[PDB]
From Swiss-Prot, chain A:
This is General transcription and DNA repair factor IIH helicase subunit XPD/RAD3. ATP-dependent 5'-3' DNA helicase. Component of the general transcription and DNA repair factor IIH (TFIIH) core complex, which is involved in general and transcription-coupled nucleotide excision repair (NER) of damaged DNA and, when complexed to TFIIK, in RNA transcription by RNA polymerase II. In NER, TFIIH acts by opening DNA around the lesion to allow the excision of the damaged oligonucleotide and its replacement by a new DNA fragment. The ATP-dependent helicase activity of XPD/RAD3 is required for DNA opening. In transcription, TFIIH has an essential role in transcription initiation. It comes from the Eukaryota. Present with 14400 molecules/cell in log phase SD medium. It is found in: Nucleus. It comes from Saccharomyces cerevisiae (strain ATCC 204508 / S288c). Belongs to the helicase family. RAD3/XPD subfamily. The lineage of its organism: Eukaryota, Fungi, Dikarya, Ascomycota, Saccharomycotina. Disruption phenotype: Essential, it cannot be deleted. The chain holds residues 335 to 445 of 778 of the full protein.
Swiss-Prot record, chain B:
It comes from Saccharomyces cerevisiae (strain ATCC 204508 / S288c). It is found in: Nucleus. TFIIE is a tetramer of two alpha (TFA1) and two beta (TFA2) subunits. Residues 7-81 bind DNA. The chain holds residues 107 to 266 of 328 of the full protein. Recruits TFIIH to the initiation complex and stimulates the RNA polymerase II C-terminal domain kinase and DNA-dependent ATPase activities of TFIIH. Both TFIIH and TFIIE are required for promoter clearance by RNA polymerase. Present with 1150 molecules/cell in log phase SD medium. This is Transcription initiation factor IIE subunit beta. Belongs to the TFIIE beta subunit family.
From Swiss-Prot, chain C:
This is Transcription initiation factor IIF subunit beta. It is found in: Nucleus. Present with 520 molecules/cell in log phase SD medium. The chain holds residues 295 to 338 of 400 of the full protein. TFIIF is a general transcription initiation factor that binds to RNA polymerase II. Its functions include the recruitment of RNA polymerase II to the promoter bound DNA-TBP-TFIIB complex, decreasing the affinity of RNA polymerase II for non-specific DNA, allowing for the subsequent recruitment of TFIIE and TFIIH, and facilitating RNA polymerase II elongation.
Swiss-Prot record, chain D:
It comes from the Eukaryota. Present with 35900 molecules/cell in log phase SD medium. It comes from Saccharomyces cerevisiae (strain ATCC 204508 / S288c) (Baker's yeast). The chain holds residues 2 to 97 of 482 of the full protein. Residues 8-88 form the HTH TFE/IIEalpha-type domain. Belongs to the TFIIE alpha subunit family. Recruits TFIIH to the initiation complex and stimulates the RNA polymerase II C-terminal domain kinase and DNA-dependent ATPase activities of TFIIH. Both TFIIH and TFIIE are required for promoter clearance by RNA polymerase. It is found in: Nucleus. TFIIE is a tetramer of two alpha (TFA1) and two beta (TFA2) subunits. This is Transcription initiation factor IIE subunit alpha. The gene is TFA1.
Amino acid sequence: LKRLIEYLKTRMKVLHVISETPKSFLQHLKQLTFIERKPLRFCSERLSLLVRTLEVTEVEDFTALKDIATFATLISTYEEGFLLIIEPYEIENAAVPNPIMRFTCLDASIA
Amino acid sequence: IAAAALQANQTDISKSHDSSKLLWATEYIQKKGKPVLVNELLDYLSMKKDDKVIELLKKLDRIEFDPKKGTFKYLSTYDVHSPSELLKLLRSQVTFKGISCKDLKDGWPQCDETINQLEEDSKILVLRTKKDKTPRYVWYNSGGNLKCIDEEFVKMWENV
Amino acid sequence: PKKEILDYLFKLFDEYDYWSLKGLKERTRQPEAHLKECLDKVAT
Amino acid sequence: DRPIDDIVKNLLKFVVRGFYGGSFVLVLDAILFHSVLAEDDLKQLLSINKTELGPLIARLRSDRLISIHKQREERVYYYVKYPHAIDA
C-alpha cells in the first residue's frame, strides 16, 4: 500500500490534462512497479479485515485510505464504459495548480 | 576508597532545578539503545510515583511512553537504518533542502559509512568539504552517472 | 563540574534571555572549552 | 505544458550533467525544479557562499545560458531565455 501511494504520488505530479483508460493506467502500473489487478481488487477486503483485526478505532487518520481502496477496486474491476482523467488543475481559478486524477462513470444503466 | 569518594560526591537528585534530573535521565536513556522500563528511572533518580517528571517525560517527543509495559525509549529524528529506507526517503523528498548526517547518525550509527558506499554506487547527490570528503547535506540522485566520463574528456570540453 | 553549572546556567537564562558571552565569562570563571561545550547543548 | 518543452528541460539537464561540473548541475537542477530565484533564497536552500556562487554564474553567463533579472521590490533574479539558450 505504501508503494501504491508512492505510485499515486509520482503519477500525481503531471503537468497537463490526460484522459487515459483504466487499462492504460494498469499497464503503466505493471510497467513501473509490480502492482497487479487482482490485489488491487482485493485491497478493499484486505484493508477492512486489517482494520477489524487491528482494533484501530481512532480511524481519524485512517479514514482517507478508504478512498484509495475504493478507487483501486473500482479501477481494477471496471475498464470499459469508464475513463480515468488526469488534470493539473484541481482548482482552475487558483493561485497554485493543485493537480487531480478524475474517474468518470459514463453509463448510467450499470447500477 | 574510590567508591567512598563517589558516594560522598553523589549529589541527591533533589536538585535546585529539575532540568538537570531531566538531562541525566535523557542521557541514561540515550546511552542505551533498547527501551527501558520505569524501574530503571526509579533506580536512577530518587523518585518513585508517576511524578510531574514522569508525566513530562511521557509528554516529551524524544521519549516514547509505552501503554504495553511502560518501556521508555529514545526517539531519533531519522527512523532510517537501511540504505533501502534512505533511498526511499530520498525519493520521497518534497523539497530540495539538504539533509544533515549527524541526525542520521542519530538512529543509524553507521550511516555516513553507507552514504560513502552509496556515493561509490552513485546513488546520491553528495555535498562534501575540501578538507576531507564529508557526508553532509545530500540529495537524491535523479542524475545519471556521477562518475560518468573521465577527466581528460572533461578537460577538453572545458577547452571547448 | 558539569552538573552544577547546568543548573547555574538554567538560572542564568532565567535571569536574562540574551545573556552576553563576555558576561558568561565572569559568571562561570571556569574553563571556557568546558563552558563552550555546555553552552552548545541547550541554547545560544 | 509542452512535452517538447519538457524534452528541452531534460536536454539542458543532460547537457550540464554530462558536460559540466556538479555545482553547475545542482544550480541548474535547483532552478528548474523551482522557478526564478533570489540569490538569498538559493543560498539558504544550498547553504553555500557567494564566493562559490561566483564562477558558476560567470560561466553560465559565458555560455549564454542564464538570463539574469534585476528589479527592486534591488532584488536579483535568474531565468533562462529559451531561444538564446537554443541558439547558443
